Write a protein that binds this DNA or RNA. Structure first.
Ligand SMILES: [Mg+2]
Ligand SMILES: [Mg+2]
Ligand SMILES: [Mg+2]
Ligand SMILES: [Mg+2]
Ligand SMILES: [Mg+2]
Ligand SMILES: [Mg+2]
Ligand SMILES: [Mg+2]
Ligand SMILES: [Mg+2]
Ligand SMILES: [Mg+2]
Ligand SMILES: [Mg+2]
Ligand SMILES: [Mg+2]
Ligand SMILES: [Mg+2]
Ligand SMILES: [Mg+2]
Ligand SMILES: [Mg+2]
Ligand SMILES: [Mg+2]
Ligand SMILES: [Mg+2]
Ligand SMILES: [Mg+2]
Ligand SMILES: [Mg+2]
Ligand SMILES: [Mg+2]
Ligand SMILES: [Mg+2]
Ligand SMILES: [Mg+2]
Ligand SMILES: [Mg+2]
Ligand SMILES: [Mg+2]
Ligand SMILES: [Mg+2]
Ligand SMILES: [Mg+2]
Ligand SMILES: [Mg+2]
Ligand SMILES: [Mg+2]
Ligand SMILES: [Mg+2]
Ligand SMILES: [Mg+2]
Ligand SMILES: [Mg+2]
Ligand SMILES: [Mg+2]
Ligand SMILES: [Mg+2]
Ligand SMILES: [Mg+2]
Ligand SMILES: [Mg+2]
Ligand SMILES: [Mg+2]
Ligand SMILES: [Mg+2]
Ligand SMILES: [Mg+2]
Ligand SMILES: [Mg+2]
Ligand SMILES: [Mg+2]
Ligand SMILES: [Mg+2]
Ligand SMILES: [Mg+2]
Ligand SMILES: [Mg+2]
Ligand SMILES: [Mg+2]
Ligand SMILES: [Mg+2]
Ligand SMILES: [Mg+2]
Lengths: 51, 99, 194, 203, 148
RNA sequence: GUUCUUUGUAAAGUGCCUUCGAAGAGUCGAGUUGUUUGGGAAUGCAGCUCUAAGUGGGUGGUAAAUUCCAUCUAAAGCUAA
RNA sequence: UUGACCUCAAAUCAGGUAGGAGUACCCGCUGAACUUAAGCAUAUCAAUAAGCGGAGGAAAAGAAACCAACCGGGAUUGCCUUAGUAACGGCGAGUGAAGCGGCAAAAGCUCAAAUUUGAAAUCUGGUACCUUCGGUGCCCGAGUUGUAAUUUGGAGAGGG
């Protein structure tokens, strides 16, 4: 919920709702960074997942 | 195309065995593509109308496609692009009324 | 001032012309230079021949399409149709032009022919340093002249048919000149219902 | 590629969304020093498009310029000459504001090399440019075969000579009839066609 | 060469050869074509009628030799056939083996009808012919073949 | 011309088959002012106002509406003689 | 309470870089008047002098948003032409190029936009070592708000 420039990401809720993808606007620009071993990350999204 | 071998007149030219060469990709430069079609449609949903566009449609559903077309021609500058806006805005008006 | 009965000259020298005067004293000098650099390019370019193989091409305008002329590069279709790749032909002595098309089979054929005749007449030394040596022939254009086509015989039979050549041109022209009017008068008729 | 959505959003500068961003950003940019180091491209797709890569040795600066005509910087309007040249107030600079913007950050970071630049915002008083500079001493660039061209001595201050993008525009350089003067270079084509050529055996 | 020049024979007479009253001065009457409409009017109609004012249509970006139609009169024509090969057809007039003459090849673009050709058939091919050129080629058993 | 080497199971070229084929925006363009040009109802540039499109767009040396045609593929870049 | 991130600083932090000179030729900006028009203001001088900024051994230009209207041509540059011509101009004085043709030299191209996604494969630095314009290993940092490969419209991509 804190990307700057915000235009990098504004179109994602719309991109999703159109693609029938569940999205979530989460609090944590750099928390999604900790997620994938970086300082920050704009996105993070699992597609596979074990059964 | 079909020259006549004569130096003058309504298809003057020296006769030659024709040979229609393969098309260039360049000659298809402003060519659609379903990606951009998807992107542009999506971007427009998110963004909306511009104030003059908003002005344009109010002028279509009033006065006429003529009155509004001149306004557009004056704003975009070029009579051709005007009509092009109007047709585009008309399709938006379709996708409103008879949703 | 103005006087006597003389032509009205227009000699533009009102501009510090003297500051920009170029006299070519080095005409001799730069000819020698021009040579002492062709020989010295021929030297390092081994047995290669200093110029690329250049196409045949018709040459434009109503003024010049009678003559035929050495073009720039060989078009993609002529290179493929001669049985080799664009990227490779360049590595030899062949000029290739990606722009420039083929709409004249009589030129196109003459060019693929031009290509093949060249291939037979060179030798393409393999990557390593053992060689038939071979003398270095410097030209290529002199080796592969571009001569003008045939068009017709030195003599033949006379064939009239009352049709005046003059009258044809006259009529060819009249046709063109009124074409649009004619259409409009019929396009007018093409709106006469009931 | 999110970039393709950036580009097309950016075309919509009178959308409610973009107008909002425009109003907030231009205020922000006005409060910072006329030239300041940008932490990152405001338009990552645009910088991208103009040669910028996210590696080390790519620098983005932001710069304000004052917008308008060039008032003839003359004493009290006084021209002292023929009435043609007696103008002061409607004269326009032959370079783009952008050309000014480039040249000024290019002067500040004179160790860098101006690659390119792009508009980002403007008010009535100002226009704002982001300028893509490139370190030529940084070995990341020197070793990058695609970019070591700009390391050359022959590119020192390309913005100052009109070799950047904005330059070759203002400088009027394209093929065709429309650019007969200016394309071989204005003053150069002139000097050519204004030279008397004299051979040894006169022609 | 200077030693051959009047200004060597003038050395020692005041005033060169330019008078005592009237001097030789810097531009009396003005530099160049000054006052063609005024103090030099007489010379400028007489010696140059027509000079001033316009006439006719402008033409933007006129390209010389869109109009390239060089002319050849029957007057010659037989010159476009090699000297030697010429008498061959000349003595053996025939609708059977008449010399084809490509005039476009020779650099021309229109056959004009000035002169007389001998009564010996010719295949003349050209863009454009005068009505009489044709009428004289046909007269002596030839034809005109319009080319391009 | 030697001579170490270290490259290889990795890089490249060509035939047909099919589905595709992303192509640069306050730009192009328009108005206007100023300047410049041989460029003339406006040759390039530049200021402010308007501001695009995707069978699009630019050019096509007389303005405009309409119908065609031809030629390239802008708004990012390098390069010896 | 501890650890990030973003932004913004500081240090004689670690290694670098800019300035000034020259300036014949070169890339831009800025910019006259004398003078010509037998006066003069548009025009001319001149897109010249003077002023300013920036390069190199050449600079710039350059692989077409070109020329053309042909039977078409095919990056740039320059010379011979075009041509004192088309056109501009108190249509006055005066100005004034372009296409084709011959020649010199020739040479071509790469990014942006694409999911590597079964593995950021990319890079600066530090440190050790060595056969040191650099190599490898290791550590930190850069980087997913995108570093490589791949493709650049002549195409080309993905599957058979
Ligand atoms: Mg003078
Ligand atoms: Mg000299
Ligand atoms: Mg050569
Ligand atoms: Mg003054
Ligand atoms: Mg004046
Ligand atoms: Mg003026
Ligand atoms: Mg640039
Ligand atoms: Mg000019
Ligand atoms: Mg001169
Ligand atoms: Mg005497
Ligand atoms: Mg005496
Ligand atoms: Mg005496
Ligand atoms: Mg005396
Ligand atoms: Mg007297
Ligand atoms: Mg005539
Ligand atoms: Mg005669
Ligand atoms: Mg393969
Ligand atoms: Mg490949
Ligand atoms: Mg483009
Ligand atoms: Mg000026
Ligand atoms: Mg103008
Ligand atoms: Mg333009
Ligand atoms: Mg063509
Ligand atoms: Mg360049
Ligand atoms: Mg400090
Ligand atoms: Mg230190
Ligand atoms: Mg300096
Ligand atoms: Mg100056
Ligand atoms: Mg003087
Ligand atoms: Mg005077
Ligand atoms: Mg006087
Ligand atoms: Mg006076
Ligand atoms: Mg002037
Ligand atoms: Mg000076
Ligand atoms: Mg130096
Ligand atoms: Mg040199
Ligand atoms: Mg260079
Ligand atoms: Mg290209
Ligand atoms: Mg060319
Ligand atoms: Mg003028
Ligand atoms: Mg007068
Ligand atoms: Mg005149
Ligand atoms: Mg002038
Ligand atoms: Mg090369
Ligand atoms: Mg395939």
């Amino acid at each position: 919920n804190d990307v700057d420039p915000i235009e990098l990401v504004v179109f994602l809720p719309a991109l999703c709702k159109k693609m029938g993808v569940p999205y979530a606007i989460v609090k944590g620009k750099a928390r999604l960074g900790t997620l994938v071993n970086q300082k920050t990350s704009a996105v993070a999204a699992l597609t596979e997942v074990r059964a | 195309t079909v020259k006549t071998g004569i130096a003058i007149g309504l298809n003057k030219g020296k006769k030659v065995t024709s040979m229609t060469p393969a098309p260039k990709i360049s000659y298809k430069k402003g060519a659609a593509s379903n990606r951009t079609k998807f992107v542009r449609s999506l971007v427009r949903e998110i963004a909306g109308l511009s104030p003059y566009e908003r002005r344009l449609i109010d002028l279509i559903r009033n006065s006429g496609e003529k009155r509004a077309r001149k306004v557009a021609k004056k704003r975009l500058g070029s009579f051709t692009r005007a009509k092009a806006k109007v047709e585009e805005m008309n399709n938006i008006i379709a996708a409103s009324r008879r949703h | 001032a103005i006087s006597k009965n003389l032509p009205i000259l227009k000699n533009h020298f009102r501009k510090h012309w003297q500051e920009r005067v170029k006299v070519h004293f080095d005409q001799a000098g730069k000819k020698v230079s021009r040579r002492n650099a062709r020989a010295t390019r021929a030297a390092k370019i081994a047995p290669r021949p200093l110029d690329l193989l250049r196409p045949v091409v018709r040459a434009p305008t109503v003024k010049y399409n009678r003559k035929v002329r050495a073009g720039r590069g060989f078009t993609l279709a002529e290179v493929k149709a001669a049985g080799l790749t664009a990227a490779y032909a360049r590595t030899i002595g062949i000029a290739v032009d990606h722009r420039r098309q083929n709409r004249n089979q009589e030129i196109f054929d003459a060019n693929v022919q031009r290509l093949k005749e060249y291939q037979s007449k060179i030798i393409v030394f393999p990557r390593n340093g053992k060689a038939p040596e071979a003398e270095q022939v410097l030209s290529a254009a002199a080796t592969f002249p571009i001569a003008q086509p045939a068009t017709d015989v030195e003599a033949r039979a006379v064939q009239d048919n009352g049709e005046s050549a003059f009258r044809t041109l006259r009529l060819a022209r009249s046709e063109k000149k009124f074409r649009g009017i004619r259409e409009k008068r019929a396009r007018e008729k093409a709106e006469a219902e009931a | 590629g999110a970039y393709k959505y950036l580009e097309e959003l950016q075309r919509k500068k009178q959308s409610d969304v973009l107008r909002f961003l425009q109003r907030v950003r231009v205020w922000e940019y006005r409060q910072k020093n006329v030239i300041h180091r940008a932490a990152r491209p405001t338009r990552p797709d645009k910088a991208r498009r103009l040669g910028y890569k996210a590696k080390q040795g790519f620098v983005i600066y932001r710069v304000r310029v004052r917008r308008g005509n060039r008032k003839r910087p003359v004493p009290k309007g006084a021209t002292y000459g023929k009435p043609t040249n007696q103008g002061v107030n409607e004269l326009k600079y032959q370079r783009s504001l952008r050309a000014t913007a480039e040249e000024r950050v290019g002067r500040r970071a004179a160790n860098l090399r101006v690659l390119n630049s792009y508009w980002v915002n403007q008010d009535s008083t100002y226009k704002y440019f982001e300028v893509i500079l490139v370190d030529p001493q940084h070995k990341a660039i020197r070793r990058d075969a695609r970019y070591n061209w700009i390391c050359d001595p022959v590119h020192k201050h390309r913005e100052a000579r009109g070799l950047t993008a904005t330059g070759k525009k203002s400088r009027g350089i394209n093929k065709g009839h429309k650019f007969n003067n200016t394309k071989a270079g204005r003053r150069k084509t002139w000097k050519r066609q204004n030279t008397l050529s004299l051979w040894r055996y006169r022609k | 060469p200077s030693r051959f020049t009047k200004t060597r024979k003038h050395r020692g007479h005041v005033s060169a050869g330019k008078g005592r009253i009237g001097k030789h001065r810097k531009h009396p009457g003005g530099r160049g074509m000054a006052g063609g409409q005024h103090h030099h009017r007489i010379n400028m109609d007489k010696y140059h009628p027509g000079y001033f004012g316009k006439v006719g249509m402008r033409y933007f970006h006129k390209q010389q030799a869109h109009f390239w139609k060089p002319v050849l009169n029957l007057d010659k024509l037989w010159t476009l056939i090699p000297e030697d090969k010429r008498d061959q057809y000349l003595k053996s007039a025939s609708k059977e083996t008449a010399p084809v003459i490509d005039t476009l090849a020779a650099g021309y673009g229109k056959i004009l009808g000035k002169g007389r050709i001998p009564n010996v058939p010719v295949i003349v091919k050209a863009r454009f012919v005068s009505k009489l050129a044709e009428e004289k080629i046909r007269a002596a058993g030839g034809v005109v073949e319009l080319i391009a």
